[PDB]
Design an enzyme around this catalytic site. Structure first.
Site, PDB file in Angstrom:
ATOM      1  N   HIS A  60      45.799  41.678  44.401  1.00  0.00           N
ATOM      2  CA  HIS A  60      45.330  41.317  43.043  1.00  0.00           C
ATOM      3  C   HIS A  60      46.490  41.523  42.081  1.00  0.00           C
ATOM      4  O   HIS A  60      46.898  42.672  41.885  1.00  0.00           O
ATOM      5  CB  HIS A  60      44.057  42.074  42.657  1.00  0.00           C
ATOM      6  CG  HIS A  60      43.515  41.641  41.327  1.00  0.00           C
ATOM      7  ND1 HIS A  60      43.073  40.361  41.092  1.00  0.00           N
ATOM      8  CD2 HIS A  60      43.356  42.306  40.167  1.00  0.00           C
ATOM      9  CE1 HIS A  60      42.660  40.259  39.847  1.00  0.00           C
ATOM     10  NE2 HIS A  60      42.810  41.433  39.262  1.00  0.00           N
ATOM     11  N   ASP A  62      47.641  40.950  38.300  1.00  0.00           N
ATOM     12  CA  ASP A  62      47.273  40.651  36.885  1.00  0.00           C
ATOM     13  C   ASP A  62      48.496  40.139  36.115  1.00  0.00           C
ATOM     14  O   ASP A  62      49.534  40.809  36.091  1.00  0.00           O
ATOM     15  CB  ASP A  62      46.622  41.875  36.246  1.00  0.00           C
ATOM     16  CG  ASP A  62      45.273  42.221  36.847  1.00  0.00           C
ATOM     17  OD1 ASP A  62      44.350  41.342  36.809  1.00  0.00           O
ATOM     18  OD2 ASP A  62      45.139  43.365  37.361  1.00  0.00           O
ATOM     19  N   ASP A 174      37.906  39.623  39.959  1.00  0.00           N
ATOM     20  CA  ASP A 174      38.039  40.634  38.879  1.00  0.00           C
ATOM     21  C   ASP A 174      37.418  40.269  37.521  1.00  0.00           C
ATOM     22  O   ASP A 174      37.334  41.169  36.687  1.00  0.00           O
ATOM     23  CB  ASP A 174      39.499  41.038  38.710  1.00  0.00           C
ATOM     24  CG  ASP A 174      39.677  42.456  38.161  1.00  0.00           C
ATOM     25  OD1 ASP A 174      38.773  43.269  38.373  1.00  0.00           O
ATOM     26  OD2 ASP A 174      40.736  42.725  37.551  1.00  0.00           O
ATOM     27  N   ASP A 309      44.916  46.044  44.078  1.00  0.00           N
ATOM     28  CA  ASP A 309      45.862  45.755  42.984  1.00  0.00           C
ATOM     29  C   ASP A 309      47.313  45.925  43.457  1.00  0.00           C
ATOM     30  O   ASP A 309      47.705  47.048  43.853  1.00  0.00           O
ATOM     31  CB  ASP A 309      45.544  46.657  41.795  1.00  0.00           C
ATOM     32  CG  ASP A 309      44.120  46.501  41.287  1.00  0.00           C
ATOM     33  OD1 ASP A 309      43.532  45.416  41.478  1.00  0.00           O
ATOM     34  OD2 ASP A 309      43.608  47.470  40.694  1.00  0.00           O
ATOM     35  N   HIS A 439      41.922  37.384  32.508  1.00  0.00           N
ATOM     36  CA  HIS A 439      40.819  38.345  32.275  1.00  0.00           C
ATOM     37  C   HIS A 439      41.340  39.673  31.703  1.00  0.00           C
ATOM     38  O   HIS A 439      40.504  40.545  31.513  1.00  0.00           O
ATOM     39  CB  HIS A 439      39.969  38.560  33.526  1.00  0.00           C
ATOM     40  CG  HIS A 439      40.747  39.011  34.713  1.00  0.00           C
ATOM     41  ND1 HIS A 439      41.285  38.119  35.614  1.00  0.00           N
ATOM     42  CD2 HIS A 439      41.029  40.242  35.174  1.00  0.00           C
ATOM     43  CE1 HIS A 439      41.908  38.793  36.554  1.00  0.00           C
ATOM     44  NE2 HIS A 439      41.772  40.088  36.307  1.00  0.00           N
TER      45      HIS A 439
HETATM   46  O1  LIG Z   1      42.626  43.228  35.488  1.00  0.00           O
HETATM   47  C1  LIG Z   1      42.977  44.607  35.444  1.00  0.00           C
HETATM   48  C2  LIG Z   1      41.741  45.495  35.530  1.00  0.00           C
HETATM   49  N1  LIG Z   1      41.211  45.526  36.902  1.00  0.00           N
HETATM   50  C3  LIG Z   1      40.028  46.392  37.056  1.00  0.00           C
HETATM   51  C4  LIG Z   1      38.930  46.060  36.059  1.00  0.00           C
HETATM   52  C5  LIG Z   1      39.472  46.024  34.634  1.00  0.00           C
HETATM   53  C6  LIG Z   1      40.644  45.070  34.548  1.00  0.00           C
HETATM   54  O2  LIG Z   1      41.191  45.050  33.239  1.00  0.00           O
HETATM   55 ZN   LIG Z   2      42.532  41.860  37.221  1.00  0.00          ZN
END
Ligand SMILES: OC[C@@H]1NCCC[C@H]1O
Ligand SMILES: [Zn+2]
Length: 994
Positions: A60, A62, A174, A309, A439
């Protein structure tokens, strides 16, 4: 075309219906805290009925959260994709899925040609599989459907261009709750399957109990099932390895091999290397977990995600996960007593196997309609906070949305020389807007320095759209015989009254009989119908007259320029004035007007009066009158009559002359933070009980009254509140400055006698309106829903609709009420890993339209329908917030070549049809020019009251036209007339030109 009003779809699971039946009890279920002790019959499995297990490795990533895109790229993601390329190349049986194409494009363009071809080989042979292939994994609450499609198109266009693949399986592990907008767009973009994770723990339990975690997700209006997409909902608390092997995280955590010597298992039993000495016991432990997970699903094919993550960063995590799992697979597959075939797999591989099982009569899946908001991960921790967190950037999203649409539409009409750098500009703008759909972007759940990165990227994107838009307008309205562009020159500056609002940005047009007597201005209309809209400009003198280019006079009003200063009191300019007039603009067209100075008051310009209830204005010819606070009534045109309290807040609306004074009270209230227990944060809304009124004190109320436009403004504490009247539904503007009020959420509530009951309607992604039912059995924060573009309440006779220019959180917490949060300042972290509260608030100008209507003569849907539909008036009001007229001030003293109009010949399409997207798909160097159009037809309520549009023929010399996927990447139907589209349908067409 289906009727989407009189026919209620028959589905196995209708989420509003389910929500009413469910008790939502938070009972301790055992090792699976929010479910039960799963039991299976072991005689279920034998050599002819094996369990087929796909272990799908993933990471994952971000695109901004704790770190910026670039920070995470350098710290983490570049190492993950380097190691993925190396380890997959070297280990042909090893598999991996990738979602975020923003990071993958960043990485791929930096590779040597050899690595690029090695990367291509592991995609071609199905080792590395792209899932969704959007630029980001978008927020599904706040996001506009147009921006969801934009970011999807940007990722899949990159994938098809550079990897010749288009994913047909979506992965959304997510986002904080899930929208049916995603299957709607995915299924019209060639998708066959999608996966979701973050749904309410009580919904997981309820569906798991009936094996309804896999379902054919259709739209709430879709009687036929043509919109249906196969959806897999994961059953457990997280997408991490402890919560993906099976129901007992204590066991699953032991099969996350990275947790051996700097991560550990919170359940205190570590993973152990798989050896000949223990593989028999470990395999038994794991296969028992798998076989419990399989009881929740209807086939003998099991999805086991393997990731977390920013996983698969270190080469030795690749080793330790691959080698241990291979020892397990080797043991399990060779030992007949298990009756398992286990292997590394991809998401597509899972879905393919499941649909093979379906075709063989082994399973028949239930149908579902509805959404999965509002999400709770545990107890009463509802994620309704992020519907409002960082509202400044939520507003900025909608502004950039419009500028990218306008920039792409205006520049689409012509091929541009590469020296113009149109393509360069539009690619930057699309990608910054696409990235913000993340997100942790539009949600406002990123760290302060990451929000700053998103803001600066969107600011550069806005500047890029402005440059494309002004260059385009100059070309469209300058005589072709004269047009000789400097591609680096500012021919027009843009004037925007609504963004930032907040800042003292707007340029004053300076006129004078000697210095500069007249100014050309141009209005753009992105919508495909004739539109009349009041526009305003700042001018150096009140003695200004408006004409079209043919010198036809245009009725105008001049108002003062007011500002508010900190008690909160208004101050007037002695050096600039607003000129206000009605622009008539062709469909997808331009109209030129001229502002001219004179000695004194011109024939066709009126002056507004000003009343300060509780100041020089230079050459403004009507002096400011004064008075004690008192009630006021105002009407503009034949439009409604609005009554205001002595604090400047709406108390009633009379629609017509012979109709009642309908009570409609605006009121500001506040929510606080719990002293004991769970703290509200960027994500969570945990109020200490109902909202309490804000003490308004003795506030100054400004009343401006004109022929064309009147307004009531008041300086409340935290909010300059304004009602603007132009002869229909009024416009509300809140300048929101929450300043220092720590542990405060400011809400705006409307109070009516409308007999709504427990029923209200809220939109999803500005595409559809869904029926909500207030549930007293659930806490306050669970009755909060996304308000991405609008909300309404109604009884048999009366509807009230609030339309938004920005996504915010909201509810109907009592009969005849609507409320919408304005901003939130939170000292505390809500323990979801952001590691800070929300203390970076800044002034934002929120914009709204308020439509009070009689609906007794309107054809309403069945009382059993889960959908609602706007009226013409409410729809057009949402259109005026999201896609207003664009305003261009000519930069120079003289404009030779100037034409008066573009697009006078463009068809004026029915009000329910929009050209959502017009985008030229080809650069100049291409033999055949190609232009993409997205057409969306909404459904408006028929209440008892236009040319055909064919986008194939909008540009000349059409050689070819087809219906495409919404991404434009695949032809669905060779036609050269585009057929008109059904209510609530979206279709894409690409026209080719010789
Ligand atoms: O995307 C990053 C975080 N992952 C876990 C849930 C909250 C989210 O902000
Ligand atoms: Zn995320």
């Amino acid at each position: 075309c289906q009727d989407v009003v009189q026919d209620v779809p028959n589905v196995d699971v209708q989420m509003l219906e389910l929500y009413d039946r469910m008790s939502f009890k938070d009972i301790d279920g055992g090792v699976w805290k929010q479910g039960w002790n799963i039991k299976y019959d072991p005689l279920k499995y034998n050599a002819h009925h094996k369990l087929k297990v796909f272990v799908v490795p993933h990471s994952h990533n971000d695109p901004g959260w704790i770190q910026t895109f670039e920070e995470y790229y350098q710290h983490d993601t570049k190492h993950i994709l380097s190691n993925a390329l190396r380890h997959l190349h070297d280990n042909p049986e090893m598999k991996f899925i990738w979602a975020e194409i923003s990071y993958f494009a960043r990485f791929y363009h930096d590779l040597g040609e050899n690595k690029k071809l090695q990367m291509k080989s592991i995609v071609k042979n199905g080792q590395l599989e792209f899932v969704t292939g959007g630029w980001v994994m978008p927020d599904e609450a706040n996001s506009h459907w147009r921006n969801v499609l934009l970011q999807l198109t940007e990722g899949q266009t990159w994938l098809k261009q550079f990897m010749n693949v288009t994913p047909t399986a979506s992965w959304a592990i997510d986002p904080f709750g899930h929208s049916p907008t995603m299957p709607y767009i995915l299924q019209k973009s060639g998708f066959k399957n999608m996966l979701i994770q973050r749904t309410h723990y009580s919904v997981k339990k309820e569906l798991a109990q009936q094996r309804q975690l896999e379902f054919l997700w259709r739209q709430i209006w879709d009687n036929k099932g043509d919109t249906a997409l196969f959806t897999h909902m994961m059953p457990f608390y997280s997408y991490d390895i402890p919560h993906t092997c099976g129901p007992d995280p204590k066991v699953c955590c032991q099969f996350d091999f990275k947790r051996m010597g700097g991560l550990s298992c919170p359940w205190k039993v570590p993973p152990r290397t798989i050896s000949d000495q223990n593989v028999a016991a470990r395999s038994d432990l794991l296969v028992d977990q798998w076989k419990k997970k399989a009881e929740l699903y209807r086939t003998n094919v099991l999805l086991i995600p393997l990731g977390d993550d920013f996983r698969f960063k270190q080469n030795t995590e690749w080793d330790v996960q691959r080698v241990n799992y291979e020892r397990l697979f080797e043991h399990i597959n060779s030992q007949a007593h298990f009756n398992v075939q286990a292997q590394f797999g991809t998401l597509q591989e899972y879905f393919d196997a499941v649909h093979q099982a379906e075709r063989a009569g082994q399973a028949e899946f239930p149908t579902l309609s509805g959404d999965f908001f509002t999400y709770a991960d545990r107890s009463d921790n509802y994620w309704s906070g992020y519907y409002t967190s960082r509202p400044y950037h939520k507003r900025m999203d909608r502004v950039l949305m419009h500028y990218v649409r306008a920039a792409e539409m205006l520049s689409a009409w012509h091929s541009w020389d590469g020296m113009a750098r149109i393509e360069e500009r539009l690619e930057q703008a699309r990608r910054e807007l696409s990235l913000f759909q993340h997100h942790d972007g539009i949600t406002g759940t990123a760290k302060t320095h990451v929000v700053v990165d998103y803001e600066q990227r969107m600011q550069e994107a806005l500047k890029a759209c402005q440059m494309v838009m002004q260059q385009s307008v100059y070309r469209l309205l300058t005589k072709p015989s004269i047009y000789s562009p400097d591609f680096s020159f500012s021919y027009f500056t843009l004037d925007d009254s609504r963004w930032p609002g907040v800042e003292d940005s707007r340029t004053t047009i300076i006129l004078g009989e000697d210095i500069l007597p007249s100014k050309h201005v141009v209005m753009h209309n992105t919508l495909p119908h004739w539109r009349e809209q009041l526009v305003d400009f700042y001018v150096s003198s009140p003695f200004v007259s408006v004409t079209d280019l043919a010198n036809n006079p245009v009725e105008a009003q001049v108002s003062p320029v007011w500002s508010w200063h900190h008690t909160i009191h208004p101050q007037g300019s002695t050096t600039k004035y607003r000129i206000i007039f009605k622009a008539r603009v062709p469909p997808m067209g331009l109209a030129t007007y001229v502002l001219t100075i004179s000695d004194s008051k011109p024939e066709h310009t009126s002056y507004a009066s000003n009343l300060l209830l509780r100041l020089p204005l230079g050459q403004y010819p009507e002096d400011v009158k004064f008075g004690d606070p008192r009630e006021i009534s105002l009407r503009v045109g034949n439009g409604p009559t609005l009554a205001f309290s002595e604090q400047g807040l709406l108390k009633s609306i009379q629609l017509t002359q012979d109709s009642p004074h309908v009570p409609v009270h605006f009121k500001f209230l506040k929510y606080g933070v719990r002293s004991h227990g769970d703290r509200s944060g960027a994500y969570l809304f945990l109020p200490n009980g109902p909202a309490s009124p804000v003490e308004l004190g003795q506030p100054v109320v400004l009343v401006t009254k004109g022929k064309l436009e009147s307004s009531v403004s008041v300086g409340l504490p935290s909010v300059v509140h304004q009602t603007i009247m132009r002869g229909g539904a009024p416009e509300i503007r809140n300048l929101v400055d929450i300043g220092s009020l720590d542990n405060t959420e400011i809400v705006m509530r409307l109070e009516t006698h409308i007999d709504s009951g427990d029923i209200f309607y809220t939109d999803l992604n500005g595409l559809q309106f869904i029926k909500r039912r207030r549930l007293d059995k659930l806490p306050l924060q669970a009755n909060y829903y996304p308000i991405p573009s609008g909300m309404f309440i109604e009884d048999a006779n009366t509807r009230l609709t609030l339309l938004t220019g920005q996504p915010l959180g909201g509810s109907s917490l009592a009969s005849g009420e609507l409320e919408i949060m304005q901003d939130r300042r939170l000292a505390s972290d809500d323990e979801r890993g952001l590691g800070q509260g929300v203390l970076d608030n800044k002034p934002v100008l929120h914009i709204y339209r308020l439509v009070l209507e009689k609906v007794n003569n309107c054809v309403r849907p069945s009382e059993l329908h889960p959908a609602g539909y706007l009226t013409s008036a409410a729809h057009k009001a949402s259109q005026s917030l999201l896609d207003p007229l664009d305003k261009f001030i000519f930069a120079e003293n003289e404009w030779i070549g100037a034409q008066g109009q573009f697009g006078g010949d463009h068809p004026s399409a029915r009000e329910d049809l929009d050209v959502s997207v017009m985008r030229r798909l080809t650069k100049s160097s291409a033999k055949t020019q190609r232009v993409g159009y997205v057409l969306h037809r909404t459904n408006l309520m028929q209440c008892g009251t236009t040319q055909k549009l064919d986008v194939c023929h909008l540009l000349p010399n059409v050689a070819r036209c087809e219906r495409t996927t919404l991404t434009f990447l695949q032809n669905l139907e060779h036609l050269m007339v585009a057929p008109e589209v059904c209510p609530m349908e979206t279709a894409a067409y690409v026209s080719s030109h010789s």
